[PDB]
Amino acid sequence: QQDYETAKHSQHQAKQQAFALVEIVQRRVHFSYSDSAGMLSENADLNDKLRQRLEHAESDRSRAREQLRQQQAQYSQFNQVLASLKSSYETKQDMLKEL
Amino acid sequence: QQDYETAKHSQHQAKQQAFALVEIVQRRVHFSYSDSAGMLSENADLNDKLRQRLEHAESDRSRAREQLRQQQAQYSQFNQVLASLKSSYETKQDMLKEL
Amino acid sequence: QEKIDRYQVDLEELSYRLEEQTDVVEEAGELQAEYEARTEATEQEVDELKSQLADYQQALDVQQTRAIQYQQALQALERARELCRLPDLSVDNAEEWLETFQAKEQQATEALLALEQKLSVADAAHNQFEQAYQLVKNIVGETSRSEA
Amino acid sequence: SQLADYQQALDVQQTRAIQYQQALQALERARELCRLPDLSVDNAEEWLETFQAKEQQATEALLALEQKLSVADAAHNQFEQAYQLVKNIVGETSRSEA
């Protein structure tokens, strides 16, 4: 299994290299007109600042999602113990009324 | 020994076929890129098609989200029930011990 | 004593219950994980398209990569339809044939496993087979090696 | 969405002229990923075929390892099944005693 894990890693790397070479072959045509050029950086300032703000928002969203998942977790466990206490109380309450 | 080499060849056939099917399972999403391949063929203004693909992906993601939420509720349910049985067993076992 | 017996029965019952619930829980968690992965992939693609539209300066590079991936997937699907000899095949239902051939491969591997054990025990020299054959003959009378 | 709206006019007029830098990045990314500093879009096809040959060889070796891995794992599975049967019948015991 150790050997097969290593072999699978190697196969993955070989596949990635082959795909990269295929990408070069496909984009040879785009390289063909590499001499072309165009205007750039017209509204870059506001676009860059907004990109930075959006990156901050995305990072905050990732933190929020992680906290949500974790919280879900803890909630889960708390439910799992509450189910056990519900059963023990109910059975004892039934047994007290029976006594 | 002859039958065993034959069985090994059959196992190799099964291995290659299963590996191929698994590979297409991985490329499952890539078949969704048929829109991407068609979109890329636009070679012109294509933001509207990008927005349509994004809306379709939003619909699919919302469907998957609802599916996941209801399945999570079902699994939770299952989990609780499993715990309630655990407690009931523990208690019945302890009372067998005592009697 | 009878009461104890009753409790015994009860415990057996809950054992069974527990077993079943265990199994159920296992399958439910499996499905939960599968749908988690699927939803995660869908939302990643959604975010990628969001960036593509927001960052239209992306300049269809991701679009080019996705088209290349689509062509590769077409090639892989054709290759599987060839190897598996299943022109009747689709991405949506390929999972069914995948699990079918998983069962096929499991059968082949279990076969070859029994075969590996039999070959390994075949290292026993010629003398043991002869001695066992003659012992069975002397006990029951003349018998064939296959029936021995 | 707001960034998309702001950049609407900016990125529409791409003029297929900033398209080729993507090819540049792909070529460079292959250059580091593929240990071929001389890798040129001209000679990249020989590298493509050779690396594809290596990939298929790797897949064949992977399947060869997978066969033996599966048989070994199933043999261990039967070993374990014997172990569980013994434990259930008698209780705790080592594999040697099995």
From TrEMBL, chains A, B:
Homodimerization via its hinge domain. Binds to DNA via its C-terminal region. Interacts, and probably forms a ternary complex, with MukE and MukF via its C-terminal region. The complex formation is stimulated by calcium or magnesium. Interacts with tubulin-related protein FtsZ. The hinge domain, which separates the large intramolecular coiled coil regions, allows the homodimerization, forming a V-shaped homodimer. The chain holds residues 940 to 1038 of 1482 of the full protein. Plays a central role in chromosome condensation, segregation and cell cycle progression. Functions as a homodimer, which is essential for chromosome partition. Involved in negative DNA supercoiling in vivo, and by this means organize and compact chromosomes. May achieve or facilitate chromosome segregation by condensation DNA from both sides of a centrally located replisome during cell division. This is Chromosome partition protein MukB. It is found in: Cytoplasm, Nucleoid. It comes from the Bacteria. Belongs to the SMC family. MukB subfamily.
TrEMBL record, chain C:
Residues 1-118 form a coiled coil. It is found in: Cytoplasm, Nucleoid. It comes from the Bacteria. Belongs to the SMC family. MukB subfamily. The hinge domain, which separates the large intramolecular coiled coil regions, allows the homodimerization, forming a V-shaped homodimer. Homodimerization via its hinge domain. Binds to DNA via its C-terminal region. Interacts, and probably forms a ternary complex, with MukE and MukF via its C-terminal region. The complex formation is stimulated by calcium or magnesium. Interacts with tubulin-related protein FtsZ. Plays a central role in chromosome condensation, segregation and cell cycle progression. Functions as a homodimer, which is essential for chromosome partition. Involved in negative DNA supercoiling in vivo, and by this means organize and compact chromosomes. May achieve or facilitate chromosome segregation by condensation DNA from both sides of a centrally located replisome during cell division. This is Chromosome partition protein MukB. It comes from Photorhabdus thracensis. The chain holds residues 347 to 494 of 1482 of the full protein.
